Design a binder for this molecule. Structure first.
Ligand code: GTP
Ligand code: GTP
Ligand code: MG
Ligand code: MG
Lengths: 243, 424, 134, 260, 225, 50, 386
RNA sequence: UUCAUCUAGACAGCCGGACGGUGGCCAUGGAAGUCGGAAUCCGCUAAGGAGUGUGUAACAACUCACCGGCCGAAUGAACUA
RNA sequence: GCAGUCAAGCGUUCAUAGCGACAUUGCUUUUUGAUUCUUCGAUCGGCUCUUCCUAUCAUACCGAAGCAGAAUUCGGUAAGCGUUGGAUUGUUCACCCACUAAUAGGGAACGUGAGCUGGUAGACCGUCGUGAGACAGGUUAGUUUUACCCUACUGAU
């Protein structure tokens, strides 16, 4: 995993969205947040500055998988062109007309499943169900309906905020088909989606998140050789005396 | 709690007097005249008395509230600060300052007297009288403030110890090695010269084991001392061993070194084993038959564990450290995560998509000559953070590269190009 | 501090003594009280601000557990005519209010209705708790 | 300003009457003044007068009088120019003190107590006409006045006092007649105190409703009944709570504290 | 932190390179700068500087004195008119004692006189009615206790006053109880345990006030043995 | 804060002036002189149309 | 006494006396310091203010929050037709100040500058520079002697130029005249430059270019006799106060015997001479080339002059300078553009401004169309057409 | 003005000595001239305090008090105006 | 402040009289920071707007502090620039909570009396008086109205 900070915030949704095949970042004063990703990734995949409707809050404004990328109505034609030019033709990019414009809060996704706010349907959202990617589910994380903020996800595991119940966790891991766990971020934060971005090979979060939280993240996401999620078997009582 | 450092400076009596009286002479006006109204004169001297009172009580309140209550804190800190500062003297000085905070009585009485002043001379003499009585009260505070400034400097430099955290004591005879055990195991500025009471205080270090903060405590020394006479340096060690919920590591140093004999070492151990009744003890030998009988001596105690090791090797150190941590965490959890799973809902396969690029890729060594440039450094080359104009282009993917520095028209006569722009 | 970014200038709509709406379900309905952080000091002038500005406020209507209690939080809608530095003047249907701690972190967990673009860019946790930007 | 008048009245007085409300005498007692009178001025007499005894039953009055006669004489009283109680007893006691102070040529009697206890009304009751201004609002008497009877007893009216015992609370100070409820901000939060103190039977007999729960619901029921609602349909909880709190103190709602 | 960390730091690294030379030079320049501050520092600061310097001179003189020096009646009659210690005190005018007080909406009636100086009223004072009181003796200018010194024993005591017998100004003032300078008062002395021949405990004695308590809140007095 | 006429800020500005700003200020002078000379030559060319 | 509440002053005591300026054309009171190392260069230029307009720009400003983002901005447009040189002045140094010891004029001059010298032009015989033209005879002994005098003495050299008001739509017929300093080196070369430049023009491209910070010196838009409240910014007294409420009530309690120069009285507001510095040029546009108002992003052929022309001004048929923001003076005035007096240590004077669009809509109302072709296309065919 | 030192060499500078019983006795984890309490003596001396300050955990080392060598004639302190 | 102790000096042509700087003792109530904090008779406060003083609250530069850093305390130069918004009239010779870099003190009036605004005639209650009336009080209602003159100031010939 990795910890770093730009301007001085532990919340990474202020700056970035990250998948298996591209990484979006916000344009800032300095190229240090971009360099933090370039260090671990190199030139292997697209690393792309730009704003969304002249805003930096791009992981919370956007959402996508390795197959594509959804952006809102407030997005300009130039930023859209810029993303199109800077990304390959393998990722289909689309501008969506919706009341709920924060797609990275309204949606949590991986390359095989997606959860959504229970609110309005659409023609091409009911078409995206199987067109663009695959399953959509209208669900709710312990009453928190802002799934992309209150839950982080990948293809190998999932994290939710700590007030989620065992019952709801088992119900939601059935839909996602992969293990879930409830945890906190950045010295006791329930908001995991903004505080962290993660995928099949790499994790980035803030400087303030503790070593137990990092160990859980590493466990549930399969980073270190080897951590198949019952390394919690080893670190049982660490979390006990921590919480 | 934990670093009573935010205590404002406690000035001596004469300096405090000079401060509070010069503040009055400076801030409040200084000029009145006989031809002025008696009400003006009264208000003048009243303002002076009231400001002078308020200054003294502000100062004294900063002392009283900033200083800790030696009772009402924790028994460990209480006993430590008692053996350091003499609790009786401490409380007596602070009570002296509280009762002096008298000044209020003088100010109120003399203001209420000033209400009836019928002349400038009368009002002036009443003002002088109030300030002089204040000065007498403060002059009678010469020794407590001298005591309290010293206690302030000391208690600011004391270390922040949580008694409830995972702790381990490091005990033994003087000149053993238990302090450079702390030096080696943990970051800590401690002296290791070869004589008895090289350290006169408790020193703290931290480390992380199993994703948990621990604190190790080096304690200066204990002697065999039949215990109705002992000094304030050893009573620190005793109170620390008695109060805290730690493991405890007795260093024996089986050797002619130490300037102390093995009989005396086991004697001290048997002397202070009543403190060990609930403390998770371990013994470490840092490299004849009676000397060995003296070791099964201590093994025969019910809860104990012996180890042989060194400061010569640096792995047995971590060994025994982890042993002490494991011994503690067990009956911590005694004295005191659920991952979900799918249950087989479908056959659709899912798998990690990763390109070959990252597996062929090389990590980033920040201290290699030949490496990746990483635009941080391109910034450093061209110009700093706020001057370097990055090209958002130069990354883009096109059919022709010669057209890098092109622009798309956005608007024509009335229309917008993006609306008419299709491939077909 | 707590906010991410600079002190940027957008017109003032909300002087002291102004009751504005809360639509989250933390329990409050209204926000009134005095204070604005980062306000100047001029004779006879009212403390009034926006730009995702942090303000002191009380619940005039809501649950008694949080009535009678002063609290900080942030403007998200104004209904005055604000100017975007990218073109047009913007304005909302109403004023909106809502609650937080001094670091910018919210007592509530979700927001109803639109939230200002610059307010969300300045306050991260508002952007995470908001489903609707503009 | 008020405590200057207090100490002036005491220093001018030969006797000090301490007026208590029979609903809450220990609330309305002011012990610090009694301690001052003990230490400073033992030559003054310091008696108690329970007033508003018509609002509570007779056995509560007898209990309190028994509890307080152990320490201080403690007459009971009801103030009215027409229908009074205790007038002759108090007259007898004052002329007793006069007979004791036969050399002074006159004897002054100060009236101390909380606001809205009935000092002015007791004086008006002794004189049997309106001598002092009276109002159900607390602070009608703002400055002292001398009043004469027998050419030998001088009554002195004092304004009301509350000592700043900080163990007290704004709620306790409200439920003693001290403040004007027009000036407080949220009068709704105090109605639970009203339910706590008062009896449901009297409370439903007074407003003629019935069977409520939830004082917030109580207010809205009473407002829908009285037609006391705003432009729209929001029932005015604030003004209705203000009226309830005025009624509670003025004695439209009967309530009383039990003694040991 | 954690202990005398700067003392450790000085032991390990040591203070600076330019520390001892600079300290020597400060000690050398102090002689110049002392005189510089004397010919400068106008006002209160110069006054205080001079006071400090004089006190420091006296201290060193006494120190050197101590160094160089450290290099008929019997015991019971050693340590040994009926005139009071203060006859012929300053005379007080009636104008300086009584202040005029005016009554009415249009203040036109005066007839009222406030005593400006400290007073002793008694134990059962009980102010007169306002329509009948002319002499006003305010509560703040009302003393119950004095600070009486025995000339022998070098001792003082905070004793309760019992009476005023003789104010030398216009014996009306005695009946009013005015405690001006030279006033003679009866004070209780039971705290001292005095007893006459016969075993009767003395609990009252004459004393003369030595101060003007209109200027000082104190009433200081000397016992007449 | 540090005023406009603060010695340290003015020294920093003095150090900045000799570098990146004076180069940009001096290039414009050569450019504008090169334009000034051509605006003379074109007027001469027009005078030599008669 | 001590006022009980501190508050800042009302007004600036440096912009006094607030009187009418003694000339419609503000006088340049300082030119930049000369460096005799560098080529010959004019220090200033003249122009005529022509309304305002709106532009959009793409901002490459690192550190800012519109970095790589679009920004709408106001701009001022000055009609800057070429300036004609007619004379030279030499200013010798003295221990009293600077003194002019000789002025030399050209051979031929225009009816415009002659009109400037005259005050009733339609009656005169127009005999202005006849004897000077005669002094321009065979060898010009006098001309060369005074020029050599300027080369020898005089220290610093200014050049008398005038405008070509004939080119503007303004109905004045009379040119303005101004001394503009030469800031290169070699007084001899300055004089030679001027000698070669008599009777010849200097365009604005030959004095300025894009991304340059210039100062505008002008006179500000008289409004006339005005009161305290609007002339200094004072509070208003509540209502129906005695002897009115739009004034200062008084000075306080304390008693002076005079009225001070500092107490904010009534009088003239405007027609004051002002010098406003550091305005960035955004475009140096030229009449020869149409599509001035067009842009690399737009590609819509049109000149900057809006539909129906500017208001209280005509069309821009001439070279123009576009600066950002608000200069002093109103439309139809005479402004002098000076260059900055000092090297500016701000990145604002380095960023290469790029425009995306210029607003050529009507300012005689709420303009919705940039071109009459757009208006035609949107409205469609009318009754009058066919 | 008064009192003192001085070619049997003054004052200022450098240099050297600055000892021995003895790490004097109590005390303490340790304290040896110098955290503290109380003695404060004798010896050998040209002179050298049971020690004037810096310093050490303790010693050490340096220092002055005092003596001597080189230098070669005036100097110091307290007071007054 | 009162009463004392001591002693650097002064000292009727005094050795053993007197005076006496700097220090210092007692009285003020207590020894263990529990003090429930507790008011006791005065014959003004609020708008606009300008300037000045420094005895500097903040900003700028420095010194000393067991000053690790961070923050803070004491002090030196310094008046260049700023030093707020509100609640409370059973009252405010003031206090309360907030914002703030900070929420410093004062003067030019109050050394009789001087912008604009709150705080005699009628009537009622209380105390006194034989009474007319007065007041220890309290409440209520209740008409000065320049400049067009000189100077100053501001702008204009
Ligand atoms: N043989 C050996 N000797 C050691 C080792 N570590 C320390 N020592 C000895 O320990 C001596 C110093 O003692 P300290 O390390 O200070 O132990 P301490 O004196 O009991 O520590 P404190 O009482 O806290 O002051 C040194 O002279 C070393 O010779 C070790 O690892 N091996
Ligand atoms: N039922 C009842 N009401 C009383 C009695 N005495 C007084 N009251 C009422 O209490 C109200 C307020 O009490 P006050 O008579 O003003 O007593 P007070 O506050 O000491 O009087 P002031 O000194 O003028 O402030 C009056 O308006 C009466 O109506 C009583 O004995 N019985
Ligand atoms: Mg050691
Ligand atoms: Mg009342």
């Amino acid at each position: 995993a990795t910890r770093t900070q730009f301007e001085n915030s532990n919340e990474i949704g202020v700056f970035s969205k990250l998948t298996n095949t591209y990484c979006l970042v916000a344009v800032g004063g300095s190229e240090n947040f971009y360099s933090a990703f370039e260090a671990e990734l190199g030139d292997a995949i697209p690393i792309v500055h730009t704003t969304i409707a002249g805003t930096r809050i791009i992981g919370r404004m956007t959402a996508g998988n390795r197959r594509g990328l959804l952006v809102p109505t407030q997005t300009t034609d130039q930023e859209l062109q810029h993303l199109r030019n800077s990304l390959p033709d393998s990722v289909k990019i689309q501008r969506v007309e919706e009341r709920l414009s924060a797609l990275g809060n309204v949606i949590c996704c991986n390359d095989y499943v997606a959860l959504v706010h229970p609110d309005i349907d659409r023609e091409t959202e009911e078409l995206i169900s199987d067109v663009l990617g695959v399953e959509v589910f209208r669900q709710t994380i312990s009453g928190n309906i802002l799934v992309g903020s209150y839950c982080s996800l990948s293809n190998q595991g999932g994290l939710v905020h700590p007030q989620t119940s065992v019952q709801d966790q088992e119900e939601l891991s059935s839909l996602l088909q992969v293990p879930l766990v409830a945890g906190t971020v950045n010295r006791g934060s329930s908001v995991v989606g903004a505080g962290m971005v993660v995928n099949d090979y790499l994790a980035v979060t803030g400087l303030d998140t503790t070593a137990p939280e990092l160990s859980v993240i590493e466990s549930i996401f399969r980073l270190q050789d080897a951590q198949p999620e019952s390394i919690s078997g080893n670190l049982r009582d660490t979390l006990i005396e921590t919480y | 709690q934990l670093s009573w450092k935010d205590i404002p400076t406690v000035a001596p009596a004469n300096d405090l007097l000079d401060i509070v009286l010069n503040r009055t002479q400076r801030k409040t006006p200084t000029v009145i005249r006989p031809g002025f109204k008696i009400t003006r004169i009264r208000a003048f001297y009243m303002r002076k008395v009231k400001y002078t009172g308020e200054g003294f009580v502000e100062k004294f309140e900063d002392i009283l509230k900033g200083f800790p209550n030696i009772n009402d804190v924790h028994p460990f800190h209480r006993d430590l600060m008692d053996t350091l500062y003499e609790k009786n003297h401490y409380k007596i000085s602070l009570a002296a300052i509280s009762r002096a905070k008298l000044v209020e009585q003088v100010a109120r009485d003399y203001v209420r007297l000033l209400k009836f002043g019928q002349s400038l001379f009368q009002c002036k003499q009443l003002k002088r009288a109030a300030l002089g009585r204040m000065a007498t009260i403060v002059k009678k505070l010469r020794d407590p403030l001298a005591y309290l400034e010293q206690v302030r400097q000391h208690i600011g430099r004391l270390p922040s110890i949580d008694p409830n955290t995972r702790t381990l004591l490091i005990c033994g005879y003087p000149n053993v090695g238990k302090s450079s055990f702390l030096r080696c195991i943990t970051k800590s500025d401690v002296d290791v010269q070869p004589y008895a009471f090289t350290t006169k205080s408790l020193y703290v270090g931290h480390f992380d084991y199993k994703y948990l903060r621990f604190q190790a405590i080096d304690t200066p020394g204990i002697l065999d001392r039949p215990t109705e006479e002992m000094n304030n340096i050893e009573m620190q060690s005793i109170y620390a061993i008695a109060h805290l919920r730690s493991c405890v590591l007795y260093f024996m140093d089986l050797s002619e070194q130490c300037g102390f004999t093995i009989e005396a070492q086991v004697k001290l151990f048997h002397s202070i084993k009543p403190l060990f009744a609930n403390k998770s003890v371990m013994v470490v030998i840092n490299t004849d038959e009676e000397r060995a009988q003296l070791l099964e001596s201590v093994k025969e105690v019910p809860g104990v564990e012996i180890m042989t090791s060194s400061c010569q090797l640096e792995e047995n150190v971590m060994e025994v450290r982890n042993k002490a941590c494991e011994k503690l965490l067990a009956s911590r959890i005694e004295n005191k995560i659920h991952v979900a799973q799918p249950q087989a809902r479908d056959d659709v396969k899912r798998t990690p998509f990763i390109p070959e690029s990252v597996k062929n890729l090389k990590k980033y060594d920040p201290e290699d000559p030949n490496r990746r440039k990483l635009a941080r450094d391109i910034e450093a080359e061209n110009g700093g953070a706020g001057v370097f104009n990055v090209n958002l282009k130069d990354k883009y993917l096109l059919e022709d590269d010669e057209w890098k520095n092109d622009i798309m028209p956005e608007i024509l006569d009335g229309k917008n190009v993006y609306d008419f722009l299709d491939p077909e | 501090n707590g906010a991410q970014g600079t002190k940027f200038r957008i017109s003032l709509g909300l002087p002291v003594g102004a009751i504005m709406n809360c639509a989250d379900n933390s329990g409050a309905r209204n926000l009134y009280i005095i204070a604005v952080k980062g306000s100047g000091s001029r004779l006879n002038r009212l403390p009034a601000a926006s730009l995702g500005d942090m303000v002191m406020a009380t619940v005039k209507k809501g649950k008694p557990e949080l009535r009678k209690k002063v609290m900080p939080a942030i403007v998200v809608r104004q209904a005055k005519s604000w100017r975007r530095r990218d073109g047009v003047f913007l304005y909302f249907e109403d004023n909106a209010g809502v609650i937080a701690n001094p670091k910018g972190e919210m007592k509530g967990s979700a927001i109803t209705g639109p939230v200002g673009k610059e307010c969300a860019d300045l306050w991260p946790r508002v952007a995470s708790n908001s489903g609707v930007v503009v | 300003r008020i405590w200057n008048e207090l100490y002036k009245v005491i220093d001018s007085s030969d006797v000090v009457i301490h007026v208590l409300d029979a609903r809450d005498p220990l609330g309305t007692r002011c012990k610090s003044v009694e301690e001052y009178m003990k230490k400073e001025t033992p030559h003054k007499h310091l008696i108690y007068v329970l007033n508003k005894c018509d609002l509570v039953p007779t056995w509560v009055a007898a209990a309190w009088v028994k509890h307080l006669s152990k320490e201080r004489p403690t007459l009971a009283f009801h103030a009215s120019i027409t229908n009074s109680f205790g007038k002759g007893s108090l007259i007898q006691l004052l002329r007793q003190f006069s007979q004791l102070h036969t050399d002074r040529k006159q004897i002054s009697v100060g009236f101390i107590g909380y606001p809205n206890t009935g000092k002015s009304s007791i004086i008006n009751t002794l004189r049997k006409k309106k001598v002092c201004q009276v109002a159900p609002i607390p602070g009608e008497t703002k400055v002292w006045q001398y009043i004469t009877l027998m050419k030998r007893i001088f009554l002195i009216d004092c304004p009301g006092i509350v000592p700043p015992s900080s163990k007290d609370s704004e709620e306790d100070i409200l439920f003693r007649g001290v403040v004007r409820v027009e000036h407080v901000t949220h009068p709704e939060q105090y109605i639970p105190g009203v339910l706590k103190r008062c009896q449901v039977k009297h409370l439903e007999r007074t407003y003629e409703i019935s069977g409520w729960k939830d004082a917030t619901e109580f207010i809205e029921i009473l407002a829908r009944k009285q037609g006391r609602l705003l432009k729209g349909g929001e029932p005015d909880e604030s003004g209705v709570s203000k009226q309830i709190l005025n009624d509670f103190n003025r004695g439209k709602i009967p309530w009383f504290v039990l003694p040991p | 932190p954690q202990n005398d960390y700067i003392e450790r730091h000085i032991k390990q690294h040591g203070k600076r390179l330019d520390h001892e030379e600079r300290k020597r030079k400060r000690e050398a320049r102090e002689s110049h700068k002392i005189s510089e501050r004397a010919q400068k520092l106008t006002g209160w600061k110069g006054k205080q500087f001079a006071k400090k310097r004089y006190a420091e001179k006296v201290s060193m003189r006494k120190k050197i004195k101590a160094h160089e020096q450290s290099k008929a009646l019997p015991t019971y009659l050693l340590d040994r008119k009926f005139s009071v210690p203060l006859p012929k005190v300053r005379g007080i005018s009636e104008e300086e004692m009584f202040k005029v007080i005016k009554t009415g909406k249009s203040r036109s009636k005066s007839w009222k006189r406030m005593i400006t100086k400290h007073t002793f009223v008694g134990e059962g004072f009980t102010r007169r009615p306002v329509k009948m009181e002319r002499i006003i003796r305010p509560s703040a200018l009302r003393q119950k206790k004095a600070n009486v010194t025995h000339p022998e024993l070098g001792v003082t005591v905070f004793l309760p006053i019992l009476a005023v017998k003789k104010n030398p100004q216009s014996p009306m003032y005695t009946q009013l109880g005015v405690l001006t300078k030279g006033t003679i008062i009866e004070v209780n002395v039971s705290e001292l345990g005095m007893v006459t021949a016969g075993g009767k405990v003395v609990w009252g004695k004459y004393a003369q006030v030595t101060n003007e308590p209109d200027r000082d809140g104190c009433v200081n007095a000397v016992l007449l043995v | 804060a540090k005023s406009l006429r603060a010695s340290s800020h003015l020294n920093a500005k003095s150090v900045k002036r000799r570098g990146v700003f004076q180069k940009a200020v001096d290039a414009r002078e050569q450019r504008i002189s090169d334009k000034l000379k051509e605006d003379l030559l074109k007027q001469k060319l027009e005078d030599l149309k008669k | 006494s001590h006022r009980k509440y501190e508050a800042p002053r009302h007004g600036h005591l440096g912009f006094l006396p607030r009187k009418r300026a003694a000339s419609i054309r503000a006088r340049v009171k300082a030119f930049p310091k000369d460096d005799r190392s560098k080529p010959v260069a004019l220090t200033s230029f003249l122009g005529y203010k022509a309304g305002m307009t709106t532009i959009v720009r793409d901002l490459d400003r690192p550190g800012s929050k519109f970095h790589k983002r679009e920004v709408v901005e106001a701009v001022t447009v000055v009609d800057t037709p070429p300036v004609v040189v007619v004379g030279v002045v030499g200013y010798v140094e003295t221990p009293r100040g600077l003194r002019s010891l000789t002025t030399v004029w050209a051979e031929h001059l225009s009816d415009e500058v002659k009109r400037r010298f005259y005050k009733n032009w339609y009656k005169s015989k127009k005999k202005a520079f006849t004897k000077y033209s005669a002094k321009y005879a065979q060898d010009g002994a006098g001309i060369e002697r005074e020029l050599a005098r300027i080369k020898k003495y005089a220290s610093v050299v200014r050049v008398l130029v005038h405008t070509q008001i004939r080119k503007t739509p303004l109905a004045q017929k009379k040119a303005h005249l101004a001394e503009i300093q030469l800031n290169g080196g070699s007084i001899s070369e300055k004089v030679d430059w001027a000698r070669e430049h008599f009777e010849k023009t200097v365009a604005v491209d030959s004095v300025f270019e894009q991304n340059e910070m210039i100062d505008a010196i002008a006179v500000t838009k008289g409004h006339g006799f005005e009161g305290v409240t609007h002339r200094w910014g004072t509070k208003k007294l509540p209502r129906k106060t005695h002897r009115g409420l739009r004034k200062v009530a008084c000075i306080g309690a304390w008693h002076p015997a005079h009225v001070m120069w500092s107490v904010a009285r009534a009088g003239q507001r405007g027609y004051h001479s002002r010098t406003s510095i550091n305005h960035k040029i955004y475009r140096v546009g030229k009449g020869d080339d149409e599509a001035n108002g067009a842009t690399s992003f737009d590609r819509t052929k049109k000149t900057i002059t809006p539909m129906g022309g500017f208001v209280h001004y005509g069309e821009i048929k001439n070279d123009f300078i576009m600066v950002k923001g608000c200069i002093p003076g109103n439309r139809k005035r005479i402004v002098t553009l000076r260059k900055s007096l000092y090297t500016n240590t701000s990145r604002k004077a380095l960023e290469e401004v790029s425009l995306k669009w210029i607003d050529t809509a009507s300012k005689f109302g709420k303009g919705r169309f940039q071109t009459p072709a757009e208006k035609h296309a949107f409205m469609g065919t009318l009754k009058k057409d066919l």
